[PDB]
Design a protein around this nucleic acid. Sequence first.
DNA 1: AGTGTATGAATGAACG
DNA 2: CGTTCATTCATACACT
Lengths: 59, 69
Amino acid sequence: TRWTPTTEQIKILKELYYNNAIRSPTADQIQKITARLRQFGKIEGKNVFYWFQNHKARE
Amino acid sequence: QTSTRWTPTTEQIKILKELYYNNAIRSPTADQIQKITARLRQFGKIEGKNVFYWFQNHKARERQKKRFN
DNA sequence: AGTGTATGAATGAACG
DNA sequence: CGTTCATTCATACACT
Ligand SMILES: [Mg+2]
């Protein structure tokens, strides 16, 4: 059953994408972002990797 | 229908994963690709480059997942 | 409460 | 090789 980002996670992901211009996070960034988002729910690095890859592809 | 993207079949994926996990093939040589392609060709149209990419992607994504997880 | 949509997940192909 | 791009499948949820 797939990951569904919370309100606070989506807000943080969009801030990283738009305010900090992170389009294709490095492996280092993915670990750090996942740890930050894990405060709000169960999440793994692949969820963050796909979120940015999908968001970039459909922007 | 106009895409030339190879569509692996369930049996082809089954054999590829056997080769990857049982036989420890990670970056098959040109001759290994020749033999693997000829075997998989019994189940669908497939070319050596399809096999080359499958192993390259499988190896890279195994490492990539360990990396960012 | 059936359906359409947004988007999570996957992967073949290819680039740097 | 790690990374990026392109399509396509899968489905959680909102709508009417
Ligand atoms: Mg409505």
